[PDB]
Amino acid sequence: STPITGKVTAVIGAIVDVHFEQSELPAILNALEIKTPQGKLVLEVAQHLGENTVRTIAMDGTEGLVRGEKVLDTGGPISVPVGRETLGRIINVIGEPIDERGPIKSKLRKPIHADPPSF
Amino acid sequence: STPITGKVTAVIGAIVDVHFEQSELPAILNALEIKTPQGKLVLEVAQHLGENTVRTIAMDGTEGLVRGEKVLDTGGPISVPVGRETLGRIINVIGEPIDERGPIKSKLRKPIHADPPSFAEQSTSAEILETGIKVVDLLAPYARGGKIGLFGGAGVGKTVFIQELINNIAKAHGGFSVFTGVGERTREGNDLYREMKETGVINLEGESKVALVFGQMNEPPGARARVALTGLTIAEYFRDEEGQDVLLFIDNIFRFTQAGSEVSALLGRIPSAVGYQPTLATDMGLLQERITTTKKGSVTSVQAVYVPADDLTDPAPATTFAHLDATTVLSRGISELGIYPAVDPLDSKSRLLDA
Amino acid sequence: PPPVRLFGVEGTYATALYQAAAKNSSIDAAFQSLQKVESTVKKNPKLGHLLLNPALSLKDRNSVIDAIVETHKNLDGYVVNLLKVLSENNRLGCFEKIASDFGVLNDAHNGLLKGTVTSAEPLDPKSFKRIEKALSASKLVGQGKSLKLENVVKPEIKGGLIVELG
Amino acid sequence: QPTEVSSILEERIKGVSDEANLNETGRVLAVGDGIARVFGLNNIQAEELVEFSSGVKGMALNLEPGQVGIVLFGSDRLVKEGELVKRTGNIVDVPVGPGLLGRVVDALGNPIDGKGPIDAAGRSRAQVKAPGILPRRSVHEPVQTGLKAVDALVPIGRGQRELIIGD
Amino acid sequence: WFRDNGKHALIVYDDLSKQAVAYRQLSLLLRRPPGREAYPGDVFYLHSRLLERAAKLSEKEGSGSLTALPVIETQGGDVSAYIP
Amino acid sequence: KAQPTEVSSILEERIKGVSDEANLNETGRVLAVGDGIARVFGLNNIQAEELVEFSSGVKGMALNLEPGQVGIVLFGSDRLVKEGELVKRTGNIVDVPVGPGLLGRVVDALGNPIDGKGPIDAAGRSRAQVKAPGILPRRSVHEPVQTGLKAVDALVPIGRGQRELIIGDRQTGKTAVALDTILNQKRWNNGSDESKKLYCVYVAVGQKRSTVAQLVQTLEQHDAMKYSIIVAATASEAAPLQYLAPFTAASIGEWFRDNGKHALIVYDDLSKQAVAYRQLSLLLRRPPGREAYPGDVFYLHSRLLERAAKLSEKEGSGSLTALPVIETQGGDVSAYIP
Numbered sequence A: 001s002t003p004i005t006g007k008v009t010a011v012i013g014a015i016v017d018v019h020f021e022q023s024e025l026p027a028i029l030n031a032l033e034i035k036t037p038q039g040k041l042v043l044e045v046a047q048h049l050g051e052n053t054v055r056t057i058a059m060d061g062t063e064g065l066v067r068g069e070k071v072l073d074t075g076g077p078i079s080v081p082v083g084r085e086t087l088g089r090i091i092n093v094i095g096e097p098i099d100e101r102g103p104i105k106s107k108l109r110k111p112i113h114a115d116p117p118s119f
Numbered sequence B: 001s002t003p004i005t006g007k008v009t010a011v012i013g014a015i016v017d018v019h020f021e022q023s024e025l026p027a028i029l030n031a032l033e034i035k036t037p038q039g040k041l042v043l044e045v046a047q048h049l050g051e052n053t054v055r056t057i058a059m060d061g062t063e064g065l066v067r068g069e070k071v072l073d074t075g076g077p078i079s080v081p082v083g084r085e086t087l088g089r090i091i092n093v094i095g096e097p098i099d100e101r102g103p104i105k106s107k108l109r110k111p112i113h114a115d116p117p118s119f120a121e122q123s124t125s126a127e128i129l130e131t132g133i134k135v136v137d138l139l140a141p142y143a144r145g146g147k148i149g150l151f152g153g154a155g156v157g158k159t160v161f162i163q164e165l166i167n168n169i170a171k172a173h174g175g176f177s178v179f180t181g182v183g184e185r186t187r188e189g190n191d192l193y194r195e196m197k198e199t200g201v202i203n204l205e206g207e208s209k210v211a212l213v214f215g216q217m218n219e220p221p222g223a224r225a226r227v228a229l230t231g232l233t234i235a236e237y238f239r240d241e242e243g244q245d246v247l248l249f250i251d252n253i254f255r256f257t258q259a260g261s262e263v264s265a266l267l268g269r270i271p272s273a274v275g276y277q278p279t280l281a282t283d284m285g286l287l288q289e290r291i292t293t294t295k296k297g298s299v300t301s302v303q304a305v306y307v308p309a310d311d312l313t314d315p316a317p318a319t320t321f322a323h324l325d326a327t328t329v330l331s332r333g334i335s336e337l338g339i340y341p342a343v344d345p346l347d348s349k350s351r352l353l354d355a
Numbered sequence C: 001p002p003p004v005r006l007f008g009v010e011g012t013y014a015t016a017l018y019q020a021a022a023k024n025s026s027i028d029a030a031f032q033s034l035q036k037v038e039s040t041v042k043k044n045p046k047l048g049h050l051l052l053n054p055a056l057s058l059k060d061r062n063s064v065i066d067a068i069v070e071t072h073k074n075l076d077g078y079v080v081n082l083l084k085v086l087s088e089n090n091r092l093g094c095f096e097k098i099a100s101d102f103g104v105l106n107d108a109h110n111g112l113l114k115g116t117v118t119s120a121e122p123l124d125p126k127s128f129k130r131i132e133k134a135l136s137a138s139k140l141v142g143q144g145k146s147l148k149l150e151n152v153v154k155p156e157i158k159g160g161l162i163v164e165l166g
Numbered sequence D: 001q002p003t004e005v006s007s008i009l010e011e012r013i014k015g016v017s018d019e020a021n022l023n024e025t026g027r028v029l030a031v032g033d034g035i036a037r038v039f040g041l042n043n044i045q046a047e048e049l050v051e052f053s054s055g056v057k058g059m060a061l062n063l064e065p066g067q068v069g070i071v072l073f074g075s076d077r078l079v080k081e082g083e084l085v086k087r088t089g090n091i092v093d094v095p096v097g098p099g100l101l102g103r104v105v106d107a108l109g110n111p112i113d114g115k116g117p118i119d120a121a122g123r124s125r126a127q128v129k130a131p132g133i134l135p136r137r138s139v140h141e142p143v144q145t146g147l148k149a150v151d152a153l154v155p156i157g158r159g160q161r162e163l164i165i166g167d
Numbered sequence E: 001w002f003r004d005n006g007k008h009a010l011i012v013y014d015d016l017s018k019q020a021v022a023y024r025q026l027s028l029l030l031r032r033p034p035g036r037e038a039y040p041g042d043v044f045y046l047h048s049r050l051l052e053r054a055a056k057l058s059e060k061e062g063s064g065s066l067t068a069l070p071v072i073e074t075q076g077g078d079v080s081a082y083i084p
Numbered sequence F: 001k002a003q004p005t006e007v008s009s010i011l012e013e014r015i016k017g018v019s020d021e022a023n024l025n026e027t028g029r030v031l032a033v034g035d036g037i038a039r040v041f042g043l044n045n046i047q048a049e050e051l052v053e054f055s056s057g058v059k060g061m062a063l064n065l066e067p068g069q070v071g072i073v074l075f076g077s078d079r080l081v082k083e084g085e086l087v088k089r090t091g092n093i094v095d096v097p098v099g100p101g102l103l104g105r106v107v108d109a110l111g112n113p114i115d116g117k118g119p120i121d122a123a124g125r126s127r128a129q130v131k132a133p134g135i136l137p138r139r140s141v142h143e144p145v146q147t148g149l150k151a152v153d154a155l156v157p158i159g160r161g162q163r164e165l166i167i168g169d170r171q172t173g174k175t176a177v178a179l180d181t182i183l184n185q186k187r188w189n190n191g192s193d194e195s196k197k198l199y200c201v202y203v204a205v206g207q208k209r210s211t212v213a214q215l216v217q218t219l220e221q222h223d224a225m226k227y228s229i230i231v232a233a234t235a236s237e238a239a240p241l242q243y244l245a246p247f248t249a250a251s252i253g254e255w256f257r258d259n260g261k262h263a264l265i266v267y268d269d270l271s272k273q274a275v276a277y278r279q280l281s282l283l284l285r286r287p288p289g290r291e292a293y294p295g296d297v298f299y300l301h302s303r304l305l306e307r308a309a310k311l312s313e314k315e316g317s318g319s320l321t322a323l324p325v326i327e328t329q330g331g332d333v334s335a336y337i338p
C-alpha cells in the first residue's frame, strides 16, 4: 500500500506533534517512523488533536528534530521479536538486539499493547 | 534627541502596562517616568508582552492613573545620584533626597543594575578586617568583603553596635559605611537619624561618614526590593573609585526576600517552595555577589537576618546562609545583663577563624 | 437571529459581519467582495498570508489593510471595518471567512453531505431537507461514484464481533 | 498545518464599530459575584468612584486595556448586563471633622445611628500617604490604658502601633 | 483630621484579618494572581499603608499624634501565619 | 495586477526581517521577552536545542518548537534581548569545546574562558547532552582511586567507574574531602604511567565567585591546576547556565573516558542544580511536584550521572568517576532530592 507520510509540526521535549494529510490519520499507540541520521526514531501516538494532527510520544531522544521532517507510519503498535531465540539475547524497548550478538532470528512478532485475559 | 514616549494601557495593582510605538521599546529593568501632580512615578520594565507593550512595576503609589497618559523612557535603569555628597543626606530608591536639605549635588549618576566584578578581578586571598570590638575581632572576626549576618533582636543594642562599627571603620582604614534600611519603619528611621546627628557620625555642618538610604515599609513592593541595590551601587562606587573598605548595613535581608517573592506573585510567576519566588536563589546571588572584595578595595556587608517561625530550615534563611561567612548572634539579654556588647560568643561563629 | 451558531473562537467576527449586513442590507455584496479579497490574498501567497504573521506592528497592519483595498475599492460596506478591527486585533483572516461562508450558505443553501452507511458526497441545494436527499443520492449513485468506498461496512463486522464474543 | 486559530479569547465581542464618546460613560459587559466588567470609561482614574444606572456605586480597581473591572458596593441584583454607567470624577473621600463625635457612621461617612445629618469640617481622601521621616518626632507622651499589666509592662505611647494578638 | 489639627486621637482598627480576607475576595474575584494560601500579593503593602499613617507629629506641624491598636486574631495560636 | 503588484512591492518594505528577507527561515524575530524565555517568530529550519544568537552576544537553546513560533531560553540575562531583535541559528546542537587543551584553565557552562589566560585549545566539540553508554560497553570497577583519607580508603572504598555521593549539611567538609582527593591524585599525576594518571574536573554550581577564586588559589598552592579543569556557574549567573554546566563538564570528562584515560569529576552542590532547574521549569509554566520540584528532577540527575562508568577493554578501558555533592538540609537523607 501507499506509505502514510506526514510533516512534523511541534517538537516539545519528548512530545512530538505531526500533521498528516487527507484521511491519513494513524491509530493511537501505533508506531510512527523518523529517519534520523543515527537510526530509527519511532513516534508512538498518544492522543489525537484533530485537524489531521496527532500528538505522539518519542521512544528515543528528540535531538536534531526540525519542524516539517518526513514521518512514516508503521501501520501498527510497536512490534518486538518473540520466541525461544530471544533467550540469551538482550533487547531494548523497540526490540533491536543490543547484545551485538547478531540479528535476532525471531519467527513471530507481537504487538506491545494487549488486553487482560478476561475471566 | 527625540524622547521615547508611550501611553499607559492598564494599571493592575502596582503592575502598570504601557504600550509603546514601533522600534521604541526599551530593555527591561529600565526606568520609566510619568508626570504626576504629586511628583515622579517611575516604572521599572519587567517583561515585554509583545505588540509593543511592556509590563512594568511601580516604585511609588499608583493612584489616580488614567489610560493614555504620557510616559518617558530615561534610557537605562534607575540611576541614583552617587558621590561623596551623598554622605549626610537621606536618599530614596528613586534617587530623590527625602531629607529636604536641598538637591543632591553629586556629579555622577550610576544605574543600580550592574554586573558583579569578573572572576579575574576577584581577590584571591581571604583577608581580615579589624572590627574594633574585642570579642568580635577575636572570636568571630569579620571578613574583609564578607556577608556578616547579625542574628540579634529587640532591646539588645543592635543599633549601638551598628554605630560603633561605623565609627571604628571610619577611624581604622577609610570607612564610609552605607546604611540600607530595607523596609524602614519610619519611626525607627527618624530615631536613627536623630541618633546619627547626636552621635556625630552624621555632621550637618561638617562631613558625615554614612549615607542613609532607606525605603519605608509603606512604599509599594519593588521599591523595597531595589533600595538594597541602590545602596549597593553607592557602596560599589565608593569602593571602585576610592579604594576604601566600605561597609554596608541591611535592615532585614528577610524583608528583601519577602519583597522579591511579593514582586514575582504580582507579575504572575508561580511561587516555588513556601510562597517564595522561583528566582529566590538567583535574586539572592545577584544581590550578594556584587558585595565583595576586589583588587582596588573591598566592601563588607552586615545584614540583619530574621528567621521565620524560628525555623532554620526555611528556604529564605538557607539562601541567606549560602552567603554569610561569619555571623553575630547578639544575646537576647543573656550577656546584656552585664557585658555591654552582648554578642553571645558561644553562639556567634566565623568561617575565617583558621590558622 | 443568525441561522447558525459559530460558538465564537475567532468565529464571532463572521457572525458580527453577518448581523451587520442583515440589519440593513447587502448580504451578498459584502460576501462576494470578501471572496475577491481572499482570491487576491491567495494570488500572492508569499506576500499574501506570510504578511498575516503576528510579528508585524500595528501601523504595519494599518498599512497592509490599506494596501488590501485597491482595484476600484472592492472592499464595500462594513468589510473595511472588519479589516480595521483585524488590524488592532487578531490578524490572520482566513478561518472567519470560511465561517461566514458557512453561515451565508446555511442562510441560502442548506446542503449537507450525508449518506449514513454510504460515504457519498451529495450536496443538496435546497432549504427543505425532507426528500431531496433521495434525488441527490440517486443522481450521485447513477453517475460518478466519487468514493462510495466504505472499505467494509460496519454492521457485518460488528455483528460478527459481538456474536463471537457470545 | 498552514495556520492556527486566531482567537482563543477576546475582550471585544460586539464588533459593530459605532457608539463613540465612552470616555466619561460606558457599558456593562459582564457582572457577577460583586464585580462588573465595563466597556468604556476611557478617562476613568484608579479606584475612582463610579455611578450606575440603578443607583448603586462602584470603585474602579481593575482597568484593563479593553474593559474596566468595577467592584460593587451593593448587591449584584440592581445591576444588569447592558446598563449605562457614568463616572463621578472623585476618588474615595469621607466627611471629616469634629461633628463625628458621638455618632456612628458607615465605611463612607453615612450616619447609621439614625440621629440626623452629620456635621463635617471637611472631606479628606480615604487613601492618603503617611507623614514622612522628618515631620515625625520621638514618642514620649504615654497612653494610659487603665490596665496595670499593660501600663507597667508594655507601655503605650502617643503615636505608637501596638498589636493585640490572640486567639 | 484630629492629628493634623493638633489634637491627640486614639484609633482601634480591631479586626484586620477580616479586612485581609475581604481583600482576598476582591483580588480573587478580579482574577488577580493569588499567593500564600491564595492571599493577594499587596496585602503586606496594604497593611503597611494602613498602619504607617499613625504617627507622632512634631511641634512645627502641631504636635499631633495617632496611636494605632490593630487587633489580629490568630488561628490555633499560629503566630507564624502569613498575615500575623 | 500592476497596482496589486506594486502595492505588494511597497508592502515588502518596512516589514523588513519579519517576512521579507531570509524568509525568516534561518532567522527569527523576538515576539516577546518573558521571565527567562523569548518567543521568536521564524527559524523554519531550526532543530531542537539548537544554539541561537540574539544579535547581542547572549546565547539561547530551544525547548519549545510549537508550530507558530519557537520558545527560546536565555543563556544569560534577559535584559540584553529585546522584542523585535533579529536572531540567527548557529546550526549546531549545544556543544562545549573538548580536548586536552583545557587542563589548567577555568571556563563557564559554554566553554568560554574566564581565567583571562587566553583562548581555549580544543580537540573537538561534543554535545552537552550526549547519550550515556549502553549495557554492552561497560566493565566492572577494579582499579582503586586513592582519596588520601583513611576513612574513605580503608572504609567506603571508591573505585574507577563508581559514583560515590558526598552527603552532608552546610558546613561538613564535602568540598574538603573533594579537594583532598584532587590533591592526593598528584602522586600519580606527576609520573609516566597513564593508567594511574587521573585527570580531574571541578563543577561550581551556584557557588560564590570569591569561593571559586580561593579554590583556584588553593590548587595553585599545591600545584594542582594541571590535570584539572574547573567549570564555574556562580550564584549570580542565570539559571540556564547553572543547569547546563554539569552536562558540559560531563562531556569534558567523557572525552578522557572515551580516549582511554581516566578522569575525576566533582559535581559540587547538585542541590543548587536542582533548584536552578526548578526555577527554569516554573518559569516555563510546568506543573510543580513534590516540594514543587518538577517531575524530571530525577531524570536530570540520572542522565547526568550515568555518563560516568568504567569502559571495557574493547573501547579502550577508559573510566570516568563522578563525585556528586548534595547538601542535606537538617541532617536528613529521607528528603526527595537526597
Ligand SMILES: Nc1ncnc2c1ncn2[C@@H]1O[C@H](COP(=O)(O)OP(=O)(O)OP(=O)(O)O)[C@@H](O)[C@H]1O
Pocket (backbone or CB within 6 Å): B351, B354, F169, F170, F171, F172, F173, F174, F175, F176, F177
Ligand atoms: N580536614 C579539615 N581540616 C581542617 N579544617 C577543615 C577540614 N575539613 C573541613 N574543614 C573546615 O570546615 C569548614 C567547612 O569545610 P568546607 O570548606 O569543605 O565546606 P563544606 O562543608 O564542603 O561546604 P560549604 O562550602 O557549603 O561550607 C571550613 O572552615 C574548612 O576550613
Ligand SMILES: [Mg+2]
Pocket (backbone or CB within 6 Å): F173, F174, F175, F176
Ligand atoms: Mg564546601
